[PDB]
């Protein structure tokens, strides 16, 4: 009936936001991840030439 | 002449609507020549983006209709003297006009498959709209040569007033 | 000098403005077909030649046979002029999706 | 939200051909209903009754809606402002019923008025003709 | 027919839903692009404050 296939589509309208959604979600932490993994590479970097520069010392 | 591009949604698989359509439908009356078009897997959009398209495939269409036409009579302004068997002397390719149609499939070197339909579309207007550019310029230009042979006609013309 | 040349460059022109055209009307046959039957995509287009004095009788068949693939509670039989809005229509509605060549 | 929504009022006889209409500009992608109107209603601009109907159009997209709004329009179809959740049709099912009643109200204090005003002017107006 | 309405609707919704399928996994090829931008923005800022005090 038209009534109850419409409703599955506004069923369908909130499973897109649900889809939208997990997309900002998954682009947020990836985001976040970036941001970390490229602070803990360079703490790397800032240990490996403070001890090169100690080295040199 | 004329001929028909339809759609045949396969019904499931291909055979049960192309050769509905085409072998028993022949068989039924032979009312029409039928062949196999083979529409590309252009990548689809959204719906909002293919409900523009709708329109804007119109009017694609209708311009790109003036532009061949736009050729073809400049082919047969500047051949007019040979312009016999007139799509002989325009064919695009091929053989013959019907030879290169019933064997048309997309071209993936002036246009590749894998971008959007609005990229393909977009070059193809470059493509057409480059073309008829070059006709004004050209064909123009072939006609005011003819112009300046006719005006020496002209010269050539009349009595010694005119000569 | 330039009868030649231009004649050439004519037949070169239209090589490329054809191609382009039959290309475009692949992709408006592609399109509305795709928005009418929807997702996924099931077309395997069909070129047809009508043979002499065949328009009437293969329209109604085809048109008939057509019924039963899309749905027909609406549209087809009649409707009013459609100026109002983005586009006017430019082509009857058929249950088949239909688009021409004049080769 | 993202589906277009929008419901509305057209005469009767009109519906199937609105409906062929819709579904020829927007094939295979729009949706709408039907119901009827209890007694014939006052048309505004003509300004006689006839039968009316409620209807209702769903849409995906506005390169969609700038089709069927304007259709609608060309049909001369009417659809005034609505709802975009239950407690928004709450909201202007109130709203409306509220400032129908005070348009009554003061429809009919305003032609009572009208009455009352012309034979006050009236109980002496022949004699402000002769003078 | 009712049957039709339906399938039309399960069609549009398909199509809302590839959409959907479409902006999210757009979104996310993107968010892979602003990890590659983001990783060499600040291991660039960071690495050339390191190597200016060193």
Redesign the interface.
């Known amino acids: 009936s038209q009534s109850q296939g419409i409703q599955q589509l506004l069923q369908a309208e909130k499973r897109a936001a649900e889809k939208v959604a997990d997309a900002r979600k998954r682009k947020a932490r990836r985001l976040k991840q970036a941001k970390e993994e490229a602070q803990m590479e360079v703490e790397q970097y800032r240990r490996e030439r403070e001890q090169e520069f100690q080295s040199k010392q | ?12 698989t ?1 055979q049960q ?2 050769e509905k ?2 072998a028993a ?1 022949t068989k ?15 990548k ?12 804007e ?2 009017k ?3 311009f ?2 003036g ?2 036409k736009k ?2 009579q ?2 047969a302004d ?2 007019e003297d040979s312009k016999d068997k007139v799509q002989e ?5 091929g053989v013959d ?2 030879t290169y ?2 064997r ?1 499939q ?2 993936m070197a ?2 590749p498959i894998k971008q959007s ?1 609005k990229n ?2 977009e070059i ?1 207007a470059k ?2 709209t480059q ?1 008829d550019n ?2 004004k310029s ?2 123009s ?2 006609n005011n ?1 003819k112009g300046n042979l006719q005006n020496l006609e002209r010269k050539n013309a009349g009595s010694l007033l005119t000569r | 000098k ?2 030649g040349p ?2 050439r ?3 070169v ?25 929807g ?1 996924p ?11 002499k004095k ?1 328009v009437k ?2 329209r109604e ?2 048109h008939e046979l057509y019924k039963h ?1 899309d749905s027909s509670a609406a549209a087809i039989i009649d409707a009013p002029m459609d100026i109002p809005g ?2 006017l229509s ?1 082509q009857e509605y058929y249950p ?8 | 939200l993202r589906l277009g929504f929008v419901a509305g009022v057209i005469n009767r006889e009109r519906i199937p051909t609105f409906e062929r209409m819709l579904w020829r500009v ?1 094939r295979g ?1 729009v949706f709408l209903r039907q119901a009827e109107i209890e007694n014939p209603l006052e048309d505004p601009v003509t300004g006689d009754y006839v039968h009316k109907s409620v209807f209702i159009i769903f849409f ?5 809606k700038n089709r069927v709004k304007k259709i609608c329009e060309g049909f001369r179809a009417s659809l005034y402002p609505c709802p975009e959740t239950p407690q928004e049709r709450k909201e202007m099912a109130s709203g409306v019923n509220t400032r129908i009643d005070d348009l009554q109200m003061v429809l009919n204090q305003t032609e009572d008025h009208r009455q009352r005003v012309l034979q006050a002017a009236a109980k002496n107006i022949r004699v402000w003709f002769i003078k | 027919s009712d049957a039709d309405v339906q399938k039309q609707i399960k069609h ?1 919704m398909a ?2 839903e590839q ?1 959907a399928n ?1 902006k999210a996994e757009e979104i996310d090829a993107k968010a892979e692009e602003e990890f590659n931008i983001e990783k060499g923005r600040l291991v660039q800022t960071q690495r050339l404050k390191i190597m200016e005090y060193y």
């Not at chain 2, 039924?28 to 252009?42: E, G, H, T």
């Open positions: 002449t004329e001929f028909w591009l339809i759609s045949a949604p396969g019904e499931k291909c609507t192309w359509l085409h439908t039924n009356n032979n009312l029409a020549v039928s062949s196999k078009f083979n529409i590309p897997d252009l689809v959009g959204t719906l909002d983006v293919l409900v523009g398209l709708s329109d495939l119109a694609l269409d209708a790109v209709e532009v061949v050729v073809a400049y082919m500047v051949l002397n325009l064919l695009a390719s006009l019907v149609i019933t048309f997309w071209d002036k246009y339909l393909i579309s193809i493509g057409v073309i070059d006709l050209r064909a230009a072939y040569l | 330039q009868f231009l004649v460059w004519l037949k022109n239209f090589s490329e403005a054809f191609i382009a055209w039959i290309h475009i009307k692949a992709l408006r046959v592609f399109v509305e077909s795709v928005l009418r039957y997702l995509v099931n077309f395997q287009a069909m070129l047809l030649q009508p043979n065949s009788k293969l068949v085809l693939l983005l586009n430019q088949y999706v239909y688009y021409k060549i004049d080769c | 927007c992608n995906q997209g506005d390169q969609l | 549009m199509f809302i959409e479409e």
